[PDB]
Symmetry: D3
Subunit: 210 residues, 6 copies
């Protein structure tokens, strides 16, 4: 309500949960005038100023104003251990600097419980069938759910937003629609869940009479 305004978004859950990826916190300044084109960002991790952020190139919004975005890459462990990320924004149209802070949801982590369901007898009169994955009992709400078969990703799924349950955990459901034939032919499908409360240092390779 009145000035250029700032919003501060956390990383994608998938990015926080795969050590191979690069999670980032994103600081977005909107409603900046052509009069005052330039914006200065200062970034802090638990109050200590850090220097690795990258400002994306500013770009005119169709309502005359500019939108400027700074992204800060965060360390996998730092984010999940609860460090606080602050974005401070400075601008000629803005008599005092504005600051916003973000960090991971606080509270005891709770492990998702995962249940799958094959299509109904009803469901299988159609050319497509839907496979269901119910995921309950998790905290915090940040989660990523995907599907695979035969070591390859299956992307024709829809997943609901986590809904808070009666016990303070979250719940969601994912549905993957495939060709009935693919299901009929005995292909195995996998609902894959990534969540901070799953935590392991394990892989495996399997062998059979082939």
């Amino acid at each position: 309500l009145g000035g250029p305004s700032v919003f501060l978004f956390p990383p994608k859950p998938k990015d926080t949960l795969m050590i191979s990826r690069t999670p980032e916190v994103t600081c977005v300044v909107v409603d900046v005038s052509q009069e005052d084109p330039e914006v200065q960002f200062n970034w802090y991790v638990d109050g200590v100023e850090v220097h690795n952020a990258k400002t994306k190139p500013r770009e005119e919004q169709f309502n005359s104003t500019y939108r400027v975005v700074s992204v800060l890459t965060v360390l996998h462990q730092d984010w999940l251990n609860g460090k606080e990320y602050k974005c401070k924004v400075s601008n000629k149209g803005l008599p005092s600097s504005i600051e916003k802070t973000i960090s991971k949801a606080k509270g005891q982590p709770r492990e998702p419980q995962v249940y799958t369901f094959p299509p109904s007898q009803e469901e299988m009169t159609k050319n497509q069938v839907s496979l269901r994955c119910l995921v309950k009992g998790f905290y915090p709400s940040d989660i990523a759910v995907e599907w695979e078969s035969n070591g390859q990703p299956e992307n024709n799924y829809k997943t609901t937003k986590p809904v808070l349950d009666s016990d303070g955990s979250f719940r969601l459901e994912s549905r993957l629609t495939v060709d009935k034939s693919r299901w009929q032919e005995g292909n195995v499908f996998s609902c894959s869940v990534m969540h901070e409360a799953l935590h392991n240092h394990y892989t495996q390779k399997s062998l059979s009479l082939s």
Copy 2:
């Protein structure tokens, strides 16, 4: 060489790699006399004295002396982040206290590569067959390898000690011997590897036409 002596052992790799378990560092004092029965342990984590250790009940060794053991439970993250554990031992037979320190091997972690092999044609003339799991390219050397089938553990395996390779990584091999019939009947077997460089926040549940 001369006095009661102390040895300081790291936790089991399996215990460091499963967040559900309780890894401990163990401090063992041997060659203590009946004259001076009592031993005092002080324990330090990066130099800060901590109080959670538990001394097991002292017990006569068959060469007249006593053996006393203190165990300190370590935090999963602390161990893997390289904190240093010191055990200081004090004893009436010991004019000055002795101290020993341990911590995880230092150096860039490198991920194991895992390869399985079915039995040879030679191998299958016998009532038993052996399945092979080769694991290379890992650092540090701390690793745990096990086997399973049908969601249950297979414990009839032998695994070699990690051997340093020409590139500074480690290598080992595990062999699981089972009844040829069990292999013939198409049961799937899994070589499971736990190592710090595997690190994930992932589970899955699979479904097929059953």
Copy 3:
């Protein structure tokens, strides 16, 4: 639900807000059997074990069980800066230790706004009158409200529990009932509010033609 149980209470707001006082966190273990009389408390400040707690003398509850209380004195600045206090409780009736953690409410502090009101014309037909103190706009909810006149405390007041308002702040009201005569004779009454968002390093002494 099943065992000896533990509750962990914060200090009194007055104690946290007067640097002269001694705020304490209190850890209470109930449902302990005569069988296992003794309880061990470990206390931690942001995870660092501390040693200054004092256990009050255990005392039989009228339902056969014992109730044991440990109190830890906390530093004025530590509490208000958000340090986390953990109480771990150990007991022969309790196969594993139980732990609870407490800390000050998190969120931006917001300053109380204070308004007083004299009695209504209605109100003053009676031998007593009531003075009203409305306090709004404060966060967190921890607050202490009292009254005084002529440099002496007035303790015949009733104060409501803070109620969350539509904007995420808290609100309450305090009423002090005094003899109508005392109000009539022009005595000045003061509603006094202590809250973390009031913060000053100020005193004054006043002088007039006396």
Copy 4:
């Protein structure tokens, strides 16, 4: 004695004692030549370099030289908890960098005791009278004393510099001169003292039969 020279000044006591204000440490470089116009400042808080300082625009001194000023805003709590502020100054006329450090006076804080005195009978034969405020027993010496009446500031006062007393505390006196009539008419005057050893989280609102 020889070169451009640097002086490093603490914040104003009033600024350190009102959480609403912005205390700053000020680093002043004098005797800089037109030859070497530019000066680089590095600033450190307990040895950690910080980036928020602002250099005021350099300005010719009437003896040919330049005077350059950097100001660093300090956090209320940091200053009063004793953090050390260092200013390092670099300049083409200056073969090596110069550094200066400042921090709050060390020693146990001691609370001011405040006493007021009305004018003498002598004093009141004149058109003006003087009101006296004696403040003793305080440590450290940083203090701010002001006056008010009727919720408005009274600025016609003179206050002595703190003088070290026989017990290692400091003492001062403040005198406010007002029109005898204003004193005669029963206006209340307040001597207000701000000092780190006063520390409260208290406000009040007063009510009377009006």
Copy 5:
């Protein structure tokens, strides 16, 4: 003035300046009654409670009272880097605990300058002669001065207490009296100075045509 009282002494300068030695801070409680024999010491290093102190056995003073001494061994680097050592003392005769804190003198270290002088012509008419060692310009005042000849210590010296000079440094003088004959026969004597501002990682071994 009134109660059992506590004094807290720093380590000996020699002990702080030789890494082979064991510097200790010593906390002494006097004026304790036979009524309340026992004293509890808590010790803190920069506010963190530590456990390595040793209480010497309490001992009756000839004025009916007891004197109890706790000594805490300090780390060479910790002391010289300015860590603060606190001793808190608790006693049945003492309604509240008393605490004292000590640390090394603060201020920029300044290196001693050392000058020797042979005996006067006057001086050498006597059977003994005195050798003089003047040491100036050092800060802080903690210093240890000794003498040697032929790789063996010379202990017949007297050294003055450091005296503050006009520039804020300290000064002292040491005199070693030996038999005139020993000086006559060409023996080399060495004034040895230990001070924190001397700091080296150097030794040497010398060789000549022997």
Copy 6:
């Protein structure tokens, strides 16, 4: 193997062992193209970015490429206490940044033992003679050995590289060749060893009948 490459060198042992000197860690980027002239260095001390490094002016190598050098001055105590220095290098020819880290050798410090030897009878038939200094038993390997006579440096010496001994310590030898006459005339020569395990706060001044 493929790209511009980076090497990261520790300070000179002499520079780490004399508090008067300025030890630096040096980060060298080679194989940079004229196409992408500019290189960005980020430097970290135990993971905290620091700003005091200085980039030397880039300079063409005779194989068409450029060589760029950044030097970071390190604190005497920091280096010897084991802090880790990281150099991160960024360049248009280099699709991702490269990083290297260095720190002092880890392991218990062990003090050098120093032995000198005069020339053999054989050796002294020649116009020059050689003096030998054997230094053993030291850890880590960083060491500086030099020679002096009559308070002046003797620079005509050759010193071997430290060689690892059978017990995990290092050994070396230094030989100083001088004119036989200088040795004959009874001049004293000194082998001087600097090593972290020598550590003192000692100087001396000597006096004799002159």
